[PDB]
Amino acid sequence: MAGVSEYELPEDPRWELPRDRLVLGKPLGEGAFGQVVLAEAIGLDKDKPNRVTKVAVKMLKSDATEKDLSDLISEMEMMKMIGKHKNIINLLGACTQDGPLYVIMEYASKGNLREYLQARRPPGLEYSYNPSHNPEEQLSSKDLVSCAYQVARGMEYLASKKCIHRDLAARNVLVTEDNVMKIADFGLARDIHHIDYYKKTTNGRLPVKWMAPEALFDRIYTHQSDVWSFGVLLWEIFTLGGSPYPGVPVEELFKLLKEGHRMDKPSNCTNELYMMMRDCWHAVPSQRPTFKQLVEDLDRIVALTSNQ
């Protein structure tokens, strides 16, 4: 709420970047946690100080409170501890001085995995209609499995760093210009207050369709609860950005999950891959597979899956 000049942002010479080295551009997306723009960083790598690098600059909004600021700092600080993996949105730098707080991150040009897939839906009948006015080339059967594999390695890494996402979804997986899957919003701080269940997001998405039952009833988040969400993500992949539990309302979702209701297999999906979803959707958290296993299985499947 107060001016940023009245606080003490953490300065870290390893990550700190002069504001005159950033060329801001068009917005990329808004949210309850703040604004993200496309930007150009000059001399990010200072082995190449005359290099420009396309980056994503995340920042607070006009209405941002002192809570929102602390969350953005904590998000930046934890990404440092977690470390670097190819398949996550990495920290590149930050502007903590001479102005508002900027957190510079890797830039994914092709948006999130949901809209990525929806814009590459073939006009057949096994999927719903392509909602994009700029449809791209459809993905092969191995591109989809490989897409799922990369999300697993990212989550496997986060798991090894004792990181729990608590909201793993296709909307939280970004895609670069080289079609690399990068997991996002893994560094967000968990709220101390009780969270609503009919609280749609900025994009109008219910986060309860990705929650594990234990995280839904007892609010218990573990690595296994993220494995549950990975099953839902897998479902989104092979439905090409489909929406989980179609026709099932929110208030009835709590009952049917308890009764053992699961989603049906998507049209174009192998039994093996659906079996993987079911293992993730196990009612017993300790019987769900680990990401280590999920990476082992998917890697084998990718080898067997065809491009043709």
Ligand SMILES: COc1cc(CCc2cc(NC(=O)c3ccc(N4C[C@@H](C)N[C@@H](C)C4)cc3)[nH]n2)cc(OC)c1
């Ligand atoms: C609100 O803080 C963030 C920050 C991040 C990490 C920083 C980041 C953001 C991005 N990228 C985009 O935000 C982006 C890029 C292209 C988009 N599109 C527009 C679409 C219509 N056409 C598509 C062809 C491309 C749409 C969105 N990279 N790194 C992720 C995030 O997620 C949950 C939220």
Ligand SMILES: [Mg+2]
């Ligand atoms: Mg969202």
